[PDB]
Ligand binder design. Sequence first.
Ligand SMILES: *[C@@H]1O[C@H](CO)[C@@H](O[C@@H]2O[C@H](CO)[C@@H](O)[C@H](O)[C@H]2NC(C)=O)[C@H](O)[C@H]1NC(C)=O
Ligand SMILES: *[C@@H]1O[C@H](CO)[C@@H](O[C@@H]2O[C@H](CO)[C@@H](O)[C@H](O)[C@H]2NC(C)=O)[C@H](O)[C@H]1NC(C)=O
Ligand SMILES: *[C@@H]1O[C@H](CO)[C@@H](O[C@@H]2O[C@H](CO)[C@@H](O)[C@H](O)[C@H]2NC(C)=O)[C@H](O)[C@H]1NC(C)=O
Ligand SMILES: *[C@@H]1O[C@H](CO)[C@@H](O[C@@H]2O[C@H](CO)[C@@H](O)[C@H](O)[C@H]2NC(C)=O)[C@H](O)[C@H]1NC(C)=O
Ligand SMILES: *[C@@H]1O[C@H](CO)[C@@H](O[C@@H]2O[C@H](CO)[C@@H](O)[C@H](O)[C@H]2NC(C)=O)[C@H](O)[C@H]1NC(C)=O
Ligand SMILES: *[C@@H]1O[C@H](CO)[C@@H](O[C@@H]2O[C@H](CO)[C@@H](O)[C@H](O)[C@H]2NC(C)=O)[C@H](O)[C@H]1NC(C)=O
Ligand SMILES: *[C@@H]1O[C@H](CO)[C@@H](O[C@@H]2O[C@H](CO)[C@@H](O)[C@H](O)[C@H]2NC(C)=O)[C@H](O)[C@H]1NC(C)=O
Ligand SMILES: *[C@@H]1O[C@H](CO)[C@@H](O[C@@H]2O[C@H](CO)[C@@H](O)[C@H](O)[C@H]2NC(C)=O)[C@H](O)[C@H]1NC(C)=O
Ligand SMILES: *[C@@H]1O[C@H](CO)[C@@H](O[C@@H]2O[C@H](CO)[C@@H](O)[C@H](O)[C@H]2NC(C)=O)[C@H](O)[C@H]1NC(C)=O
Ligand SMILES: *[C@@H]1O[C@H](CO)[C@@H](O[C@@H]2O[C@H](CO)[C@@H](O)[C@H](O)[C@H]2NC(C)=O)[C@H](O)[C@H]1NC(C)=O
Ligand SMILES: *[C@@H]1O[C@H](CO)[C@@H](O[C@@H]2O[C@H](CO)[C@@H](O)[C@H](O)[C@H]2NC(C)=O)[C@H](O)[C@H]1NC(C)=O
Ligand SMILES: *[C@@H]1O[C@H](CO)[C@@H](O)[C@H](O)[C@H]1NC(C)=O
Ligand SMILES: *[C@@H]1O[C@H](CO)[C@@H](O)[C@H](O)[C@H]1NC(C)=O
Ligand SMILES: *[C@@H]1O[C@H](CO)[C@@H](O)[C@H](O)[C@H]1NC(C)=O
Ligand SMILES: *[C@@H]1O[C@H](CO)[C@@H](O)[C@H](O)[C@H]1NC(C)=O
Ligand SMILES: *[C@@H]1O[C@H](CO)[C@@H](O)[C@H](O)[C@H]1NC(C)=O
Lengths: 49, 183, 197, 435, 50
Amino acid sequence: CTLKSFTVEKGIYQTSNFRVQPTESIVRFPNITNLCPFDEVFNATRFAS
Amino acid sequence: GTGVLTESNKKFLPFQQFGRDIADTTDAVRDPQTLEILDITPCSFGGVSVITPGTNTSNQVAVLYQGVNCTEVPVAIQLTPTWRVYSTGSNVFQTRAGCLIGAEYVNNSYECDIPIGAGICASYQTSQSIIAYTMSLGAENSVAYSNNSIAIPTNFTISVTTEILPVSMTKTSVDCTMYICGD
Amino acid sequence: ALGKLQDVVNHNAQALNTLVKQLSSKFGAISSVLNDIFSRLDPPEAEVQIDRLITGRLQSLQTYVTQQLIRAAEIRASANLAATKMSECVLGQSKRVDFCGKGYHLMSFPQSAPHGVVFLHVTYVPAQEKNFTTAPAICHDGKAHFPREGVFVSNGTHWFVTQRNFYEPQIITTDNTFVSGNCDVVIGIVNNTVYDP
Amino acid sequence: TMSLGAENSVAYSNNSIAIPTNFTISVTTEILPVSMTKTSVDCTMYICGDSTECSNLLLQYGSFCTQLKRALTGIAVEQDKNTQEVFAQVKQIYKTPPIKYFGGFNFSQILPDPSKPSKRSPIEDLLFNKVTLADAGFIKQYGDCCAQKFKGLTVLPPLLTDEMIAQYTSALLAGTITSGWTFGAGPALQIPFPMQMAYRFNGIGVTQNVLYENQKLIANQFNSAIGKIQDSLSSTPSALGKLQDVVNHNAQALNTLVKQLSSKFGAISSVLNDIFSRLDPPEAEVQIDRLITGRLQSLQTYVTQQLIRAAEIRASANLAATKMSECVLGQSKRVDFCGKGYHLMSFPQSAPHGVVFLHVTYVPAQEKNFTTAPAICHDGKAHFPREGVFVSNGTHWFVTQRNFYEPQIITTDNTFVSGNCDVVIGIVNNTVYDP
Amino acid sequence: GTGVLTESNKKFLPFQQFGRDIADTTDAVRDPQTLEILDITPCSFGGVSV
Ligand SMILES: *[C@@H]1O[C@H](CO)[C@@H](O[C@@H]2O[C@H](CO)[C@@H](O)[C@H](O)[C@H]2NC(C)=O)[C@H](O)[C@H]1NC(C)=O
Ligand SMILES: *[C@@H]1O[C@H](CO)[C@@H](O[C@@H]2O[C@H](CO)[C@@H](O)[C@H](O)[C@H]2NC(C)=O)[C@H](O)[C@H]1NC(C)=O
Ligand SMILES: *[C@@H]1O[C@H](CO)[C@@H](O[C@@H]2O[C@H](CO)[C@@H](O)[C@H](O)[C@H]2NC(C)=O)[C@H](O)[C@H]1NC(C)=O
Ligand SMILES: *[C@@H]1O[C@H](CO)[C@@H](O[C@@H]2O[C@H](CO)[C@@H](O)[C@H](O)[C@H]2NC(C)=O)[C@H](O)[C@H]1NC(C)=O
Ligand SMILES: *[C@@H]1O[C@H](CO)[C@@H](O[C@@H]2O[C@H](CO)[C@@H](O)[C@H](O)[C@H]2NC(C)=O)[C@H](O)[C@H]1NC(C)=O
Ligand SMILES: *[C@@H]1O[C@H](CO)[C@@H](O[C@@H]2O[C@H](CO)[C@@H](O)[C@H](O)[C@H]2NC(C)=O)[C@H](O)[C@H]1NC(C)=O
Ligand SMILES: *[C@@H]1O[C@H](CO)[C@@H](O[C@@H]2O[C@H](CO)[C@@H](O)[C@H](O)[C@H]2NC(C)=O)[C@H](O)[C@H]1NC(C)=O
Ligand SMILES: *[C@@H]1O[C@H](CO)[C@@H](O[C@@H]2O[C@H](CO)[C@@H](O)[C@H](O)[C@H]2NC(C)=O)[C@H](O)[C@H]1NC(C)=O
Ligand SMILES: *[C@@H]1O[C@H](CO)[C@@H](O[C@@H]2O[C@H](CO)[C@@H](O)[C@H](O)[C@H]2NC(C)=O)[C@H](O)[C@H]1NC(C)=O
Ligand SMILES: *[C@@H]1O[C@H](CO)[C@@H](O[C@@H]2O[C@H](CO)[C@@H](O)[C@H](O)[C@H]2NC(C)=O)[C@H](O)[C@H]1NC(C)=O
Ligand SMILES: *[C@@H]1O[C@H](CO)[C@@H](O[C@@H]2O[C@H](CO)[C@@H](O)[C@H](O)[C@H]2NC(C)=O)[C@H](O)[C@H]1NC(C)=O
Ligand SMILES: *[C@@H]1O[C@H](CO)[C@@H](O)[C@H](O)[C@H]1NC(C)=O
Ligand SMILES: *[C@@H]1O[C@H](CO)[C@@H](O)[C@H](O)[C@H]1NC(C)=O
Ligand SMILES: *[C@@H]1O[C@H](CO)[C@@H](O)[C@H](O)[C@H]1NC(C)=O
Ligand SMILES: *[C@@H]1O[C@H](CO)[C@@H](O)[C@H](O)[C@H]1NC(C)=O
Ligand SMILES: *[C@@H]1O[C@H](CO)[C@@H](O)[C@H](O)[C@H]1NC(C)=O
């Protein structure tokens, strides 16, 4: 295929490359904790009119 | 990024988060969740080269995996997936040039036929299989030198040898306008 | 070895074929056909795609000339070597080792070949060597004698002087040797009789 | 302002001649690059780093990857050939005799040393250690690491390892010591070494009797001269710069290629994923196009530089190939081709990516003024010296070889007769002794 | 395009209408009106040297 010929002469030919594909994706946690306190405002006793 | 992740012996300053090599490619990263420094190495890759005696002298081929251990990337490994690389049963030889598959090694030394590299050459020899060997540097002869030993030829032969020298190449002209803008 | 001449032909044929194949390259444009772009893209924006093609063809042409220029230098170096070989080997006997054939060079015959030249080097190589015992000089009458153009040899009984390349022993005479110094200084001198004609 | 050299004048005068009294054997070193580093490039990896879209966009650009790969492959094959031509000039490997006594000389500095695990001469190691201070590859990181790489740039090992190359230099040295020039022309013929040097003395026009009379003096000069080579080589002044320049040039070119990756080439940024993420796919490809072309043009430029650089290396290799054939394998009449002065013999020494030649040359010294005449009139017939010069020490006339002052009485054997006495200019009354 | 239109002996299979050369340039065509095989050759040209 690379030589584009049906016959090949004796020798050494570079053809392609091989690469190991990734197996699984992954992502890491910034360990975020700055949660928004808007929830407890919704979770309040009294509410303005 | 993509690569094999492993723990690293590198030491990062607290504000340091990633590290780059000489070529300014990310070679180490600090994990966000855990303060551990993890080394990144690219997934194994390399060129593949095929040794053949010639289509008409058999069809068996020998595959060279350049610049990688046979261990890391054996017949188990995809790219050229239909290539099973035969099997581990097929002779696997480790050379400085790279992994070699489909050829065996012998202690007998012949003249080089197909230059693998790093002092290794392959050929088709007897039953008929691709065989890899170390180059025979030449026949070994020791000449007897002494204080008073002289060798003088008694008889001669006339030899005719041929030398081939290129002299001229094809003269070519290009009509640029037609080539770049044809009709 | 005619492949050396053949490789010159193939490289030019291969390079030209590579240039031809480059035309089909789109070079990031819509298509590789100049006419189709113009009918498909109006002049206000067609030149954007044409320029991509023009640059692509121009780059391919530029590389081809550069490759030819580099290759031409290699041929010229070969041509100069051939010219020197024709002058030094064909037109005269060359003392340079291995410049004309292998071994001592006698003559060279030029033969024309397509896009090259073939040299038939007539060389003299020795054979059938025979060991001998030698001595740097011969002491005859208290005076050291040195071979004028040969080397002293003996088969074991009688010493002889002969030419270096061919074995032709001769009786050591005052004509074959020139006398210098005395016998003590020379290391390895050997007693023998020097015949006087 | 540069001073070209020390101003010198020579007292040219008719009938005035200067002849050396004796000589000085000098060993000069000459270094020639032979082969450069064999390199290959992964076309896709360099242009696109783990980007499928760039990989797709790379396909329609053309068959440049095939073209670039072929160009570098031709260079790599040529490099192995260059090494083969320089060193593989001996059909048969020769072994040094077990006894190392050669008429009073060493060759121990240049002969391979069995003590070292690497079968290299002491001089070879000094060349190796000095050059390898700035070297590349080493193990080549065959095991996991680095030496560039991971960008597509790889280094291919040479066909011939250093050890086998050293064997060739060892084989050449053994043949030259034991056989002189004979093994180059044909079958190797042994010849006692003092006789071999005597032959080479005749080649440069010095009668062999001179060598045998001063064998001890010559041997000491030769041994001492070799010793100075090690000190001069091990000295900080680096004559190995030519070999170093090849290493630097390849490293400089490769470093430029890596640097070119960071270039934006007119795009907004040099990060492929940044282009795709920040820009919409319609506009993103425009920047990708510029980056691909810019990276390509960088790759094309590097190939052209390598191809040009491959020329003189082959030219240097071709010159080295002739020098090994013309100087090592025989005496060379060509002036200054093999060292400075009258060439006697040359010893090849392998070096990283090159070869070092040790030219042994004959240098005259301690000249003396003399009075000379073109011919001698004795019996009404002019006498001409057959080889020597006609010199008068002041009151008598002698004939001596041109290079060495070895006066002799004028005899009919030393001089051939031709013509009368009046025609020639500068003839001188004298008597020609007849034995 | 511009060229010389001639009858062509190359046989096109019934589905085939276009023919291409080594350079991947259209070398033959089937006429839309009447199904016939026509090859296209560029008009005569040549370098001029004085
Ligand atoms: C945020 O990071 C901390 C440490 O930086 C994590 O704590 C881990 O688990 C316990 C409880 O804090 C510690 O004793 C361990 O030493 C921590 N492990 C490591 C590897 O550091 C904490 O779990 C992280 N936040 C979340 C939500 O997981
Ligand atoms: C001349 O005679 C000597 C003495 O035997 C030869 O030296 C040995 O020759 C044989 C075969 O010829 C070798 O196998 C030995 O190795 C030689 N001896 C040593 C110490 O090497 C010498 O070879 C003879 N000359 C020729 C041309 O054969
Ligand atoms: C010199 O060498 C030549 C060639 O190596 C040989 O001559 C041959 O001698 C044999 C026996 O006399 C003949 O049958 C051959 O025909 C000769 N060769 C040729 C080419 O004619 C022999 O070794 C030596 N000859 C002499 C005369 O010394
Ligand atoms: C060494 O060479 C000489 C020269 O041929 C040999 O001496 C001659 O040998 C032949 C054959 O026996 C006799 O016919 C001659 O009379 C010899 N010449 C003299 C002057 O005696 C000698 O024999 C050779 N050495 C050996 C050991 O054969
Ligand atoms: C060669 O012969 C000479 C002379 O016969 C030897 O030199 C010395 O000569 C004197 C008088 O002629 C003798 O009294 C000595 O006995 C000789 N020396 C020796 C060691 O006997 C010379 O030695 C001889 N050399 C060889 C190698 O035979
Ligand atoms: C030898 O050399 C000397 C000086 O180098 C020559 O002396 C002069 O030569 C020129 C050249 O013809 C004459 O014109 C002068 O007249 C010479 N000087 C005197 C004082 O006469 C001398 O001529 C040379 N010998 C010969 C034979 O020409
Ligand atoms: C030849 O030239 C050499 C130059 O080295 C002279 O050799 C020196 O000779 C003196 C006295 O004999 C010794 O002390 C030195 O050691 C010698 N030099 C070396 C390097 O060993 C020699 O004198 C010259 N010969 C003539 C006849 O002038
Ligand atoms: C040449 O002959 C000498 C004998 O003179 C030997 O070489 C060495 O010579 C020195 C001094 O003469 C002796 O001390 C050594 O013992 C000799 N070497 C050996 C191994 O005995 C030797 O016979 C010859 N040289 C060779 C064959 O290279
Ligand atoms: C041959 O040269 C060698 C190497 O210089 C000599 O051997 C050395 O001699 C020196 C004398 O100062 C000493 O350092 C050692 O004995 C040897 N080795 C080294 C590494 O220097 C030797 O003397 C010379 N002559 C011979 C061997 O006959
Ligand atoms: C030029 O001629 C000869 C050279 O051999 C010298 O003459 C000899 O001188 C020595 C002492 O100086 C005498 O013992 C010899 O008897 C002399 N021989 C002859 C033949 O004259 C002469 O001295 C040389 N000239 C100079 C200036 O040295
Ligand atoms: C060389 O010797 C010859 C022989 O004597 C000299 O020729 C003589 O020269 C004188 C004066 O010129 C004449 O009177 C004689 O008649 C000459 N005789 C002969 C036989 O020719 C010649 O002059 C000498 N050359 C030199 C340079 O002195
Ligand atoms: C190579 O194969 C071809 C086709 O099978 C054949 O014609 C040719 O003779 C073969 N070459 C040799 C050297 O046997
Ligand atoms: C041949 O070489 C291999 C390793 O290269 C070695 O293990 C073996 O002992 C050698 N000899 C034979 C007969 O296999
Ligand atoms: C192959 O990998 C092993 C570790 O798995 C390593 O020890 C060895 O050196 C590697 N091969 C080479 C030729 O370095
Ligand atoms: C020869 O004589 C000239 C003139 O006196 C002088 O300059 C020169 O040095 C002398 N040559 C030698 C070798 O002394
Ligand atoms: C109309 O087109 C068809 C298809 O090519 C053709 O066969 C037919 O002859 C055409 N009509 C005329 C009047 O030529």
